[PDB]
Coordinates of C-alpha atoms and ligand atoms in Angstrom, one line a residue:
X1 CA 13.6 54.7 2.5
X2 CA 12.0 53.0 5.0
X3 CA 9.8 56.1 6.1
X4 CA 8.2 56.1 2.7
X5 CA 7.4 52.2 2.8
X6 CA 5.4 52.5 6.2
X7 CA 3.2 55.2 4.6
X8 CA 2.6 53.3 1.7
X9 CA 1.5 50.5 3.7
X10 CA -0.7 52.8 6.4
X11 CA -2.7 54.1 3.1
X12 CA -3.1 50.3 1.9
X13 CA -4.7 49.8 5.4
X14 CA -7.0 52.4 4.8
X15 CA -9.0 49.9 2.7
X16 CA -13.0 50.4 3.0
X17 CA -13.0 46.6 2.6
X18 CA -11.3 46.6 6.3
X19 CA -13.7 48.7 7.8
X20 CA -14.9 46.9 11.4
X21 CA -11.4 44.3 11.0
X22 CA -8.8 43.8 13.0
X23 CA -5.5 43.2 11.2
X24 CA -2.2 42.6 12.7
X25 CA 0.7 43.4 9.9
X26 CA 4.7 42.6 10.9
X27 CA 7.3 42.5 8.6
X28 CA 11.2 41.7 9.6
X29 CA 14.4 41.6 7.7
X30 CA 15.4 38.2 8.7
X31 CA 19.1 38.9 7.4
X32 CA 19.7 41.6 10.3
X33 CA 16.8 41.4 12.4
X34 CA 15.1 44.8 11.7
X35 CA 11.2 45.2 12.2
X36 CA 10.5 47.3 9.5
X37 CA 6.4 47.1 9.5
X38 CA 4.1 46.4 13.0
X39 CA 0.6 47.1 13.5
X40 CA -1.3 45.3 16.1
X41 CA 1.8 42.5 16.5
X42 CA 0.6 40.8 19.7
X43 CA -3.0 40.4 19.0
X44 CA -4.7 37.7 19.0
X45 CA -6.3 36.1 15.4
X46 CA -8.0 33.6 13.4
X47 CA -4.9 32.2 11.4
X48 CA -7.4 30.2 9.3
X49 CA -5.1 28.1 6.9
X50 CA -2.1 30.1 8.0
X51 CA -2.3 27.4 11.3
X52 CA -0.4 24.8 9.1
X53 CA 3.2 27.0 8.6
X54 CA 2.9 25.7 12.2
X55 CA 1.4 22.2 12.2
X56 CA 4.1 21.7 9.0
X57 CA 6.9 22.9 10.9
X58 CA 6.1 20.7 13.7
X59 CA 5.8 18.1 11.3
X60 CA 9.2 18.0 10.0
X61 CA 10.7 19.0 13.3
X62 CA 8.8 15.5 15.0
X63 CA 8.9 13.0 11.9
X64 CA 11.7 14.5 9.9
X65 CA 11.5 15.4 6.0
X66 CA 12.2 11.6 5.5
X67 CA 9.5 10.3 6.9
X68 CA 6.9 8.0 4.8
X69 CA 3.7 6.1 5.8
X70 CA 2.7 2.6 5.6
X71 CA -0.2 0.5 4.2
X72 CA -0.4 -3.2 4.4
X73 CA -2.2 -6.6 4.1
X74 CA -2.3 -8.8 6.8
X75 CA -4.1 -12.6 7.1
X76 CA -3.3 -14.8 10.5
X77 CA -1.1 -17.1 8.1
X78 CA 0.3 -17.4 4.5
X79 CA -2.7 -18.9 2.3
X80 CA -1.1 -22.9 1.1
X81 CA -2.2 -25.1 -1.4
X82 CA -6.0 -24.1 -1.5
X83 CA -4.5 -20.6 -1.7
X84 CA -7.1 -20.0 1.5
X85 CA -7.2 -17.5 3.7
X86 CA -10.2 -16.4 6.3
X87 CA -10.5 -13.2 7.4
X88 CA -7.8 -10.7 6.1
X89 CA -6.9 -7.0 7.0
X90 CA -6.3 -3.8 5.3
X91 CA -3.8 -1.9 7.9
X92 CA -3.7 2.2 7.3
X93 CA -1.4 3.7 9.3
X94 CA -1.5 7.5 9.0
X95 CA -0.9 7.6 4.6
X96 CA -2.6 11.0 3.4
X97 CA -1.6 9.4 -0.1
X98 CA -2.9 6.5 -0.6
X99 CA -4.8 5.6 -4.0
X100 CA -7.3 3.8 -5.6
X101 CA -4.4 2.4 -7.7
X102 CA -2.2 1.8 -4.7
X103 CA -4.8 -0.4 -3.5
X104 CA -4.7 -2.3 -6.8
X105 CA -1.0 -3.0 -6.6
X106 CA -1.4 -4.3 -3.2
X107 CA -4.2 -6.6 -4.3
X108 CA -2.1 -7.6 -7.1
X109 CA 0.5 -8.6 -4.2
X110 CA -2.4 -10.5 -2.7
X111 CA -2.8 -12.3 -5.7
X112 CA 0.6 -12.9 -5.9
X113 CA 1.3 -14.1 -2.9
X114 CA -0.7 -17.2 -3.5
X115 CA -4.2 -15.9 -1.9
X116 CA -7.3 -16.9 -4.5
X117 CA -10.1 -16.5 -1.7
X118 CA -10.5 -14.9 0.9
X119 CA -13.2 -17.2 3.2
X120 CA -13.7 -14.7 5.7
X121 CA -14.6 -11.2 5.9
X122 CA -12.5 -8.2 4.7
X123 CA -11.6 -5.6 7.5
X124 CA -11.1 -1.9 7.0
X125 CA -8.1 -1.4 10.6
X126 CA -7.4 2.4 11.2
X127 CA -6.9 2.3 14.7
X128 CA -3.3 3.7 14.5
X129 CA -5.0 6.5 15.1
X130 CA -8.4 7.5 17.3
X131 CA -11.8 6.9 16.1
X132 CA -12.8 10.9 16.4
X133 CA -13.5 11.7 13.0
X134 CA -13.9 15.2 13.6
X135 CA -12.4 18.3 15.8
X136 CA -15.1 19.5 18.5
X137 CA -15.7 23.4 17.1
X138 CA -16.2 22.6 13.2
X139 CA -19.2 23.0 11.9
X140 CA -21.8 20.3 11.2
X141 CA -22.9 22.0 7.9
X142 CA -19.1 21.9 6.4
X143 CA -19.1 17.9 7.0
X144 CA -20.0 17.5 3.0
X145 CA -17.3 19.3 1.7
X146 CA -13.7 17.5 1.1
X147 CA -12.3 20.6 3.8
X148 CA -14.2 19.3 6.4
X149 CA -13.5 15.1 5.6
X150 CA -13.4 12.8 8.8
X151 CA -10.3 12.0 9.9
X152 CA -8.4 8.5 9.8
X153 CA -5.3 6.3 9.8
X154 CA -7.0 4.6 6.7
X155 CA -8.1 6.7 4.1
X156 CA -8.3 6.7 0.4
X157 CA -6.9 9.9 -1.1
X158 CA -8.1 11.5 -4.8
X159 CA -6.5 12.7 -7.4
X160 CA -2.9 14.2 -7.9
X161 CA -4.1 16.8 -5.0
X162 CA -5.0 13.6 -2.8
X163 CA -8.2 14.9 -1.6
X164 CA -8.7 12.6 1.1
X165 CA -12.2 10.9 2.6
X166 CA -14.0 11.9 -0.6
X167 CA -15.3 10.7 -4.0
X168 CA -15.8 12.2 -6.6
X169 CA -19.3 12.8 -8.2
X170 CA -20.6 13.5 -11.7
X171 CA -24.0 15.2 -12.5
X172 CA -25.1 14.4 -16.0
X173 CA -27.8 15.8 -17.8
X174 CA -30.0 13.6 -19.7
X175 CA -33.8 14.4 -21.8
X176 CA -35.0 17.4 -20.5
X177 CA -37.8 16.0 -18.2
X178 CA -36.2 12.8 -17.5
X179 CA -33.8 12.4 -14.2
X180 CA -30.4 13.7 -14.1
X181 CA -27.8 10.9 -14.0
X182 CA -25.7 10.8 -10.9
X183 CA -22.4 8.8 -10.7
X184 CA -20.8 8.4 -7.0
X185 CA -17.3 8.0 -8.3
X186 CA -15.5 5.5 -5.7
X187 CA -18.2 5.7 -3.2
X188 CA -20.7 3.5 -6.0
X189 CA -22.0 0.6 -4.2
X190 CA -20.4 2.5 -0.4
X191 CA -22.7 5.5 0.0
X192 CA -26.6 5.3 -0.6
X193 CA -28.0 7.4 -3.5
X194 CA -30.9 10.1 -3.4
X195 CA -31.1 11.7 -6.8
X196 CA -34.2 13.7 -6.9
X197 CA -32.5 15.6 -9.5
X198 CA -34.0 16.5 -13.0
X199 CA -32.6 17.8 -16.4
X200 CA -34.1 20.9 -17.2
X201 CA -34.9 22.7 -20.7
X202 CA -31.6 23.6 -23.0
X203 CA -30.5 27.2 -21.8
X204 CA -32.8 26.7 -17.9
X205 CA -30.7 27.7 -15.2
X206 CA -29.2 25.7 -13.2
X207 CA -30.0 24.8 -10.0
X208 CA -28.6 21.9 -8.7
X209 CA -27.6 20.8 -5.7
X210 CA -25.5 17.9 -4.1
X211 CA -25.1 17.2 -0.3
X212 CA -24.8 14.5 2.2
X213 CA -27.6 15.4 5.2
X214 CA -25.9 15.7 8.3
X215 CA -25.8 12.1 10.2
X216 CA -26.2 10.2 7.1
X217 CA -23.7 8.5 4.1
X218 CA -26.4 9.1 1.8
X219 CA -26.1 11.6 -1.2
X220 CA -28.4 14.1 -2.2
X221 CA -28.5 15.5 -5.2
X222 CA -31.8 17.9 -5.7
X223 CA -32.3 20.6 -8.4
X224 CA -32.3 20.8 -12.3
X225 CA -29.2 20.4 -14.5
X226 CA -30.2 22.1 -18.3
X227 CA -29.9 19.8 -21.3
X228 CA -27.1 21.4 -22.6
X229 CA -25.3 22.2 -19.2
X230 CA -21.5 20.8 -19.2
X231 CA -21.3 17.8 -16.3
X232 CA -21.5 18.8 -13.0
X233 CA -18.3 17.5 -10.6
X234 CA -17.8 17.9 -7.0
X235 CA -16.2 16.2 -4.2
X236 CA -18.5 15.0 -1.4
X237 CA -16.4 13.6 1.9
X238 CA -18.0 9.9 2.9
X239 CA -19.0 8.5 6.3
X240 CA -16.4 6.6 7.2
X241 CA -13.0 6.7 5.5
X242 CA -11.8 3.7 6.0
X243 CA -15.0 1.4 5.2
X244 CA -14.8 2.9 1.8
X245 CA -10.9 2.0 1.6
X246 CA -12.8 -1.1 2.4
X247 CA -14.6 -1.5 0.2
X248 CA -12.6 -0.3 -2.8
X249 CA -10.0 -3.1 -2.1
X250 CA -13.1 -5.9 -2.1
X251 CA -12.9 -4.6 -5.4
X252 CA -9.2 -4.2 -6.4
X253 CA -9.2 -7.8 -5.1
X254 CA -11.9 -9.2 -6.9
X255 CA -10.6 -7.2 -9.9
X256 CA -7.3 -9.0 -9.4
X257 CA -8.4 -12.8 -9.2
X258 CA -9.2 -12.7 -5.6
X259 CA -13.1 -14.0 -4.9
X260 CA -14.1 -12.2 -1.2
X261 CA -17.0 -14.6 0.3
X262 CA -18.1 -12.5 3.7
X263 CA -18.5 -8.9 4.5
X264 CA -16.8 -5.5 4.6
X265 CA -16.4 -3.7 7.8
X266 CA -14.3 -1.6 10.4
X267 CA -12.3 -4.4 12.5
X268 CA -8.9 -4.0 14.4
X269 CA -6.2 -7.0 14.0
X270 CA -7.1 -9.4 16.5
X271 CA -5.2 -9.4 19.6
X272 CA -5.4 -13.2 19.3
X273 CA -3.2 -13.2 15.9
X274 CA -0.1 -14.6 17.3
X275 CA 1.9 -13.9 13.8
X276 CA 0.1 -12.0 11.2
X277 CA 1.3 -12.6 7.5
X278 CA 2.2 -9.3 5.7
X279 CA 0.8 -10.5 2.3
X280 CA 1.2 -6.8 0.8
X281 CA 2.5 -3.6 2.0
X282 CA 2.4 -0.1 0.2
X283 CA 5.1 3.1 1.1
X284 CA 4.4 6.5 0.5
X285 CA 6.9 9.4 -0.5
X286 CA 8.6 11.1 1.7
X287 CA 6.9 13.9 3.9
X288 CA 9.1 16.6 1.9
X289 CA 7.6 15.9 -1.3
X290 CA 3.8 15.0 0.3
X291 CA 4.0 18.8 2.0
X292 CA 3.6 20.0 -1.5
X293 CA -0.1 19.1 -2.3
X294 CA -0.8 19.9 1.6
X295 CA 0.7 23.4 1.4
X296 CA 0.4 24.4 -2.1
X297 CA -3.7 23.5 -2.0
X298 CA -3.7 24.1 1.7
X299 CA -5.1 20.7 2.3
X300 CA -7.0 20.2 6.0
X301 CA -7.1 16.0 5.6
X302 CA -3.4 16.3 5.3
X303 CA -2.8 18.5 8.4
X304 CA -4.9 16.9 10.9
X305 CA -3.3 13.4 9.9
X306 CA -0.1 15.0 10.3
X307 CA -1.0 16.3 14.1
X308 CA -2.0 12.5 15.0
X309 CA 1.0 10.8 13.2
X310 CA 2.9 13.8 15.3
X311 CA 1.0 12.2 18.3
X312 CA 2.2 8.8 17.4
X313 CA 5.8 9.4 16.7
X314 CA 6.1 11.5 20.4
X315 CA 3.4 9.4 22.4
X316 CA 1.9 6.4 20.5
X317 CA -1.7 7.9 20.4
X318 CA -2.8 9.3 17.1
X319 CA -4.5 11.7 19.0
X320 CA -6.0 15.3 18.5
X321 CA -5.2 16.2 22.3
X322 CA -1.8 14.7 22.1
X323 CA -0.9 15.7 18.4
X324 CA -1.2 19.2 19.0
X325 CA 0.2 19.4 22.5
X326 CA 3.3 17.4 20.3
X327 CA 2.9 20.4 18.0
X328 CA 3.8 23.2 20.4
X329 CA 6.6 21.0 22.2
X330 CA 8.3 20.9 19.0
X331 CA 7.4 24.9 18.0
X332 CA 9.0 25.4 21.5
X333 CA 12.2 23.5 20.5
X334 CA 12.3 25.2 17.4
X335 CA 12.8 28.6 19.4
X336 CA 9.9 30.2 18.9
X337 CA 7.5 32.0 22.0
X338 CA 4.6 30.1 22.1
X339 CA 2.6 32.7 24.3
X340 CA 0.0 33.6 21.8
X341 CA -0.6 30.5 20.2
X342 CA -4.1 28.4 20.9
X343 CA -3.9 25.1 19.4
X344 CA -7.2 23.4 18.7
X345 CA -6.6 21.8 15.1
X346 CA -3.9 21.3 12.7
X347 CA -5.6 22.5 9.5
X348 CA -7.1 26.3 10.9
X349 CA -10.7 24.8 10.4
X350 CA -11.2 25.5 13.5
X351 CA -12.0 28.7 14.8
X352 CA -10.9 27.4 18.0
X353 CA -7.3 28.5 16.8
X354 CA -5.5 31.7 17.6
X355 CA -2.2 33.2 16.9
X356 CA -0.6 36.2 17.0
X357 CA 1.2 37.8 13.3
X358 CA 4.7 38.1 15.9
X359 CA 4.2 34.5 16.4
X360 CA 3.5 33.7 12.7
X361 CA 7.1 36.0 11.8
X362 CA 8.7 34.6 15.1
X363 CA 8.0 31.1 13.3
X364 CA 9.2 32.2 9.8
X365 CA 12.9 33.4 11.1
X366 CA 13.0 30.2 12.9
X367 CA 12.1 28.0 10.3
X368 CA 14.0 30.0 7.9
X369 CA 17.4 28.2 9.5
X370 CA 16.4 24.9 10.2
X371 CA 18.2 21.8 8.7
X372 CA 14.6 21.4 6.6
X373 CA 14.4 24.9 5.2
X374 CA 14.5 24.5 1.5
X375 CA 11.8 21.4 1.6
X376 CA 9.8 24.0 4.0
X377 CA 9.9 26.7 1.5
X378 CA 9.3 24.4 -1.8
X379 CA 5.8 23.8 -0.1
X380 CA 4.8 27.5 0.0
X381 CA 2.6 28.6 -2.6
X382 CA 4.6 31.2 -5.1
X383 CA 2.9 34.9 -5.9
X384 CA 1.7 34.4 -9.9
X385 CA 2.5 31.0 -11.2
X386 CA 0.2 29.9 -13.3
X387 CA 1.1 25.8 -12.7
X388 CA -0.8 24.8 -9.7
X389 CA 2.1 22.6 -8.0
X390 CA 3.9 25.7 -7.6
X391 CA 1.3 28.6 -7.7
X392 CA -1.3 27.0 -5.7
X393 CA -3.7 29.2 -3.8
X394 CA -1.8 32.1 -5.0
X395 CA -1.7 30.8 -9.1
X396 CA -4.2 33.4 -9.6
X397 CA -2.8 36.4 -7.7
X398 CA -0.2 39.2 -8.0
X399 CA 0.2 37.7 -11.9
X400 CA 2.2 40.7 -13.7
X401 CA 3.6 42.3 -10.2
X402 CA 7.1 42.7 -8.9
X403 CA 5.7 40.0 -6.5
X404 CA 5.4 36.9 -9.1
X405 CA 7.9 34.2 -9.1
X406 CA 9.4 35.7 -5.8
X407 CA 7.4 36.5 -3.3
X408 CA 6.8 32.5 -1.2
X409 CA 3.7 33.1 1.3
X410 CA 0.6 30.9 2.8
X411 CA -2.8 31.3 2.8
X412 CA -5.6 31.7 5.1
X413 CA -9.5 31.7 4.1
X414 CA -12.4 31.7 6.1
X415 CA -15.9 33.6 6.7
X416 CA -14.1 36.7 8.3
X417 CA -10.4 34.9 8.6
X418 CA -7.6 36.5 5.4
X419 CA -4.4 35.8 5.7
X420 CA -0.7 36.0 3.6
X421 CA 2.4 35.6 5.6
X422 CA 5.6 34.0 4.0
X423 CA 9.0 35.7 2.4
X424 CA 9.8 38.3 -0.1
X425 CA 13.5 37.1 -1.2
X426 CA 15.3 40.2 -2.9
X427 CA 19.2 40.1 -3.6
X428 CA 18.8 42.8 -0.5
X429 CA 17.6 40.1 1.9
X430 CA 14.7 37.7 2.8
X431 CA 11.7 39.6 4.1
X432 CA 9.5 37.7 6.6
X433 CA 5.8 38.9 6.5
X434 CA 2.5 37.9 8.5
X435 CA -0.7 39.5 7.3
X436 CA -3.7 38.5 9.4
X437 CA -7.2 40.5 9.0
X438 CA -10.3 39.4 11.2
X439 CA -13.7 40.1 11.4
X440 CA -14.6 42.0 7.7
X441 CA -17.7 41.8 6.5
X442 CA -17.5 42.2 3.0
X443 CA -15.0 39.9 0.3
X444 CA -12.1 39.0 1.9
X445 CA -9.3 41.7 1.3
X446 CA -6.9 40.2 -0.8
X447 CA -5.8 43.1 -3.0
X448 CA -4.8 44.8 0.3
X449 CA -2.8 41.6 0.9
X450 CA -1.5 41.7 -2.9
X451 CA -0.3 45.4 -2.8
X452 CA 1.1 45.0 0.8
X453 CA 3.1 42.0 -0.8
X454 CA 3.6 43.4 -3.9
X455 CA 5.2 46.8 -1.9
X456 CA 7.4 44.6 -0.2
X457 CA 9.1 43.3 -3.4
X458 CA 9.4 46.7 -4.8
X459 CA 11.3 47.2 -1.6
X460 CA 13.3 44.4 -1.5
X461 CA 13.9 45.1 -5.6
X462 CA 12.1 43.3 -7.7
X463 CA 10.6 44.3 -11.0
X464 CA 7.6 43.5 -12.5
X465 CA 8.1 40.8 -15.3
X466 CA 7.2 42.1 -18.7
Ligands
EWA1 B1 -7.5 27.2 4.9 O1 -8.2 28.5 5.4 O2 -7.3 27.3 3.4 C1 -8.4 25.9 5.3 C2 -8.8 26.0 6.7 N1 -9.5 25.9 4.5 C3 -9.9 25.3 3.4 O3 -9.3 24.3 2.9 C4 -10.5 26.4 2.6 C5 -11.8 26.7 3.0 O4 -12.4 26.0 4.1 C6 -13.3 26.6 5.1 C7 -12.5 27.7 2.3 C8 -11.8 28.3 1.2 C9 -10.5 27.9 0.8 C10 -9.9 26.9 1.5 O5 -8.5 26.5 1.1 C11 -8.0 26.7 -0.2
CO2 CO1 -17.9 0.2 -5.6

């Protein structure tokens, strides 16, 4: 019966939609070992997204699923009487979690600790990690977008996603003729404003636009919202992470009793402080639960933060070059061959990253029996659920199949870059499958992914739920 499963998936190959790709297809039983599907198993792909099975892995191999990061508050000494302190310190060190509300509670803190003004200046410190915001090979033209956010050790996340080194902003139509209004979420009063943006006629089209020109922290929203067009959201990344984190907390503290008389900047803790007073700290969950909203969403902020905490932990540099050479240490004492694996990010942004769809199996089987398996697998994206915490990128895919609920398998989306690879879990056994296509040219061939997936449950026996 396996004769007739290797036609089925040479016809689904056959797509017109992979005319001009390359596409390398393995599938093993990991129970006994048996390569039952491989096409082009050795060659050399984009993995896209698919690059953080690998950067997770690492992650939990190097910092454990236990692991949490910290945030804290530091002045050179406890405020006394005058409840005075000069200037104080907002510490990041590596938290892909950390809220606008965690900031409150930890001006609260500040508050509480006896603080009522802070004489100095407020510094934004993130220099746990390096001051390279972004990897070499990504595109200048992505920097807007949350996916391509700069990277640091401080950096305020949003929403229950925790999009990281964004804000949120909200494009609101007003009289037709008169200008749209724009509202910068968190970045109000952080990033500079250009709204050349108009409200157009009840049923115009709209047209509008929002960006942040290349070089700048300015915002520009151009184009025409209609006067009866819903509000317009998108997240827009900010220069500089942690001066907005920064800034946000000039506010929590001012919000919470606490009058800030100088400025808000980047600044590491002095050298000089001799015995700086903690005067509020902040922990995040464990890595186990915060691989959920990295895997589920396939989150790139999260990833890239992980490779430099990764370069922390094994080296104390959070550090791209360092990070991911800490990446394929720990792949390697994992168990897996690292021969076809090129390592230039964490997140798959880059398309500096290859791997093979053997290595992407080899890694499966291997993860598969590690100690952290079942927090590993509770992070992969499930075929058909319709809850986005435990559907994610594949919510809206293989709904209806034998595939939903079952089958457990990552992501991978670029221009030209598809790829599914995860398990198919049948009371037979647990089916490990890489699916990596390169180089189409016209939408990106998920329903070849689908039905390859969806085969392999059929196989494996599963039904369709009805
Ligand atoms: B991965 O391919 O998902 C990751 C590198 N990308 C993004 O987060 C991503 C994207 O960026 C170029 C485009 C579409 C989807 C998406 O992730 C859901
Ligand atoms: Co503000």
């Amino acid at each position: 019966r396996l004769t007739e499963l290797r036609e089925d998936i040479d016809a689904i190959l056959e797509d017109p939609a992979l005319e001009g790709a390359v596409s390398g297809v393995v599938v093993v039983d990991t129970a006994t070992g048996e390569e039952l599907y491989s096409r082009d198993g050795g060659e050399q792909l984009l993995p896209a997204s698919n690059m953080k099975l690998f950067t997770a892995a690492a992650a939990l191999e190097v910092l454990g699923a236990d692991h949490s990061f910290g945030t804290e508050v530091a002045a050179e000494s406890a405020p006394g009487r005058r409840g005075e302190v000069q200037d104080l310190y907002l510490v990041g060190r590596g938290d892909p979690t950390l809220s606008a509300e965690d900031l409150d509670a930890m001006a609260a803190e500040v508050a509480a600790s006896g603080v009522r003004t802070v004489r100095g200046d407020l510094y934004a410190d993130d220099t746990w990690f390096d001051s390279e915001r972004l990897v070499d090979d990504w595109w200048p033209e992505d920097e807007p977008y949350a996916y391509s956010a700069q990277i640091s050790a401080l950096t305020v996340a949003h929403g229950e996603r925790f999009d990281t080194g964004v804000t949120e902003v909200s494009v609101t139509p007003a009289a037709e003729g008169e200008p749209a209004d724009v509202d910068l979420g968190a970045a109000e009063g952080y990033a500079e404003l250009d709204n050349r943006a108009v409200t157009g006629a009840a049923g115009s089209a709209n047209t509008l636009v929002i960006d942040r020109p290349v070089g700048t922290n300015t915002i520009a929203v151009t184009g025409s919202l209609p006067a009866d067009a819903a509000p317009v959201t998108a997240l827009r990344t900010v220069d500089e992470p942690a001066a907005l984190a920064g800034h946000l907390f000039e506010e929590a503290l001012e919000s919470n009793g606490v009058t800030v008389k100088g400025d808000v900047g980047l600044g590491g803790v002095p050298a000089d402080w001799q015995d700086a007073e903690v005067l509020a700290d902040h922990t995040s969950a464990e890595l186990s639960e915060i691989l959920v909203p990295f895997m589920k969403f396939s989150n790139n902020g999260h990833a890239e933060m992980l490779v430099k905490s990764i370069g922390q932990e094994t080296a104390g540099a959070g550090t791209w070059d360092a990070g991911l050479v800490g990446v394929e240490e720990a792949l390697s004492g994992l168990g897996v061959d690292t021969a076809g694996l090129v390592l230039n990010d964490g997140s798959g942004l880059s398309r500096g990253n290859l791997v093979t769809a053997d290595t992407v199996v080899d890694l499966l089987g291997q993860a598969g029996s590690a100690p952290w398996a079942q927090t590993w697998s509770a992070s992969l994206p499930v075929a058909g659920e319709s809850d986005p915490f435990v559907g994610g990128t594949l919510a809206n895919r293989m709904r209806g199949t034998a595939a939903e609920g079952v089958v457990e398998a990552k992501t991978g989306t670029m221009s030209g870059v598809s790829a599914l690879s995860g398990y198919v879990p049948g009371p037979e056994g647990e089916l490990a499958f890489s699916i990596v296509n390169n180089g189409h040219s016209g939408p990106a061939p998920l329903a070849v992914q689908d039905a390859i997936a969806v085969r392999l449950a059929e196989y494996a026996g599963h039904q369709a739920p009805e």
